[PDB]
Amino acid sequence: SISEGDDAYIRSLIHFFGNQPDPWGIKDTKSVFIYANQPFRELVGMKNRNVEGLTDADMDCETAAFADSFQAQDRLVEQGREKKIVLDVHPYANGWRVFTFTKTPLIMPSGRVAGTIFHGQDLTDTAGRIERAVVELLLNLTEREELVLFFLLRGRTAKDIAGMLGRSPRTIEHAIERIRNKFGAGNKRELIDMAMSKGYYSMVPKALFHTQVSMLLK
Amino acid sequence: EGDDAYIRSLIHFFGNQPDPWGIKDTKSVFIYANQPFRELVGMKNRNVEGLTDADMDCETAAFADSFQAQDRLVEQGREKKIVLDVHPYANGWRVFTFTKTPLIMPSGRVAGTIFHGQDLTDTAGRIERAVVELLLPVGLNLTEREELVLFFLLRGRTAKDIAGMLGRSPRTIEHAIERIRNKFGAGNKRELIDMAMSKGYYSMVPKALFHTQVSMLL
Ligand SMILES: Cc1cnc(O)c(C)n1
Numbered sequence: 001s002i003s004e005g006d007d008a009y010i011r012s013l014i015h016f017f018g019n020q021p022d023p024w025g026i027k028d029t030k031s032v033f034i035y036a037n038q039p040f041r042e043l044v045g046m047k048n049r050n051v052e053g054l055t056d057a058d059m060d061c062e063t064a065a066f067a068d069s070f071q072a073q074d075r076l077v078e079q080g081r082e083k084k085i086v087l088d089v090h091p092y093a094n095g096w097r098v099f100t101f102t103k104t105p106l107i108m109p110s111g112r113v114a115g116t117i118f119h120g121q122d123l124t125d126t127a128g129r130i131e132r133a134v135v136e137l138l139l140n141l142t143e144r145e146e147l148v149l150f151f152l153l154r155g156r157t158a159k160d161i162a163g164m165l166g167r168s169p170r171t172i173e174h175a176i177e178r179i180r181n182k183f184g185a186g187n188k189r190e191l192i193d194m195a196m197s198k199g200y201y202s203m204v205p206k207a208l209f210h211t212q213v214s215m216l217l218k
Numbered sequence: 219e220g221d222d223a224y225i226r227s228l229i230h231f232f233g234n235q236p237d238p239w240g241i242k243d244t245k246s247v248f249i250y251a252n253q254p255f256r257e258l259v260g261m262k263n264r265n266v267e268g269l270t271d272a273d274m275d276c277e278t279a280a281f282a283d284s285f286q287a288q289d290r291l292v293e294q295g296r297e298k299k300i301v302l303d304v305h306p307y308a309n310g311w312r313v314f315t316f317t318k319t320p321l322i323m324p325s326g327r328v329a330g331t332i333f334h335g336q337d338l339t340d341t342a343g344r345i346e347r348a349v350v351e352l353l354l355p356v357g358l359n360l361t362e363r364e365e366l367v368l369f370f371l372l373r374g375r376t377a378k379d380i381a382g383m384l385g386r387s388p389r390t391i392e393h394a395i396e397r398i399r400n401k402f403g404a405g406n407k408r409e410l411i412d413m414a415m416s417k418g419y420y421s422m423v424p425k426a427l428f429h430t431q432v433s434m435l436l
Pocket residue numbers: 056063070086088101118214
């Protein structure tokens with residue numbers, strides 16, 4: 001039959017997923033799990049409990065609170081050939097982590113949309129590793145100062161930042177002055193140079209830390 | 219044998235992923251690569267492969283040796299390895315990560331390697347737009363060379379300095395300066411410098427600055 005091949009292909013793909021350190025898995029058109037390797041089941045609280053066939057509202061991890069929105073993603077992949085990447089920042093079973101979950105349509109020798117495949121990648125450590133690699137390819141900021149500097153390093157001017165944060169330009173100018181002085185820079189251009197050379201382009205404003213998200217990248 | 223049933227299943231798998239995906243052997247001779255990869259390498263459209271890494275119509279081949287070296291220290295392990303590949307690929311310079319894992323199959327023998335190519339620039343920019351959206355509720359469309367020329371214009375260099383650093387004629391760099399000027403609406407070089415400096419363009423870093431050919435493991 002053809003179902004013979006559609007079950008040989010699926011056991012192929014569990015053998016495939018079972019030998020990667022990344023969280024790998026596939027679920028159905030009901031967003032119900034068909035398989036997930038030991039990495040994925042270990043990122044959720046499912047260390048040794050092998051639970052499968054359930055929804056994203058799994059056992060033993062905070063991920064379940066966004067299970068709903070997971071499945072929503074799981075259907076907008078299914079109505080398309082193209083893949084979609086999800087930034088999942090979550091208090092996983094061993095602390096807060098910044099993952100990328102790439103979700104792709106599941107096609108098989110059927111040719112039918114059977115569900116989705118998801119590939120989770122741990123961005124926390126590799127962000128720093130690739131950052132040191134890429135740049136060798138070539139002070140206590142407050143929260144608002146971190147925001148102002150994030151947008152300064154990204155081509156915005158003081159009036160643009162005033163708009164983005166809903167304060168007056170004088171307020172943002174005062175913030176820039178205090179950032180500049182904390183860097184020891186003599187003017188805005190020296191501030192840009194100092195911040196770019198000290199790794200601050202890769203800084204994430206700490207007000208963003210430890211808040212649970214899952215967002216499709218666009 | 220059953221393990222080449224698994225190879226055909228994963229060939230169908232790789233053939234239905236938007237990412238550059240492929241498999242090689244212990245002699246690093248190609249076993250399969252989807253249309254994305256060999257369109258990212260020069261074999262867009264044409265050659266099925268039974269080739270090594272040197273046999274491709276793209277400058278990547280000059281680093282085939284070190285590719286193969288990577289392909290041998292993944293193979294003597296189970297865990298993944300991430301390689302920063304910055305290359306003038308068949309459609310321009312790109313910053314990829316090639317994550318390579320051993321090719322294990324229902325035999326259990328190390329048959330070769332699987333490589334996953336991910337464009338790091340695109341997903342980095344996607345994560346940055348996502349972070350901007352989390353922090354919230356005039357696109358002049360400069361080319362890459364124009365971005366480089368303006369970067370150096372704002373830093374006190376003249377057209378012949380840019381010509382030297384970029385290996386182009388002084389008249390080519392002057393044409394680039396003229397077209398940047400017109401895109402800004404500036405009347406002369408110094409008004410262009412002032413306008414760009416006041417519009418936040420001092421903080422843009424050209425991606426062309428990372429266009430140095432490397433392939434190195436993290
Ligand atoms: C942690 C997580 C996030 N999104 C998903 O779709 C899955 C399956 N797991």
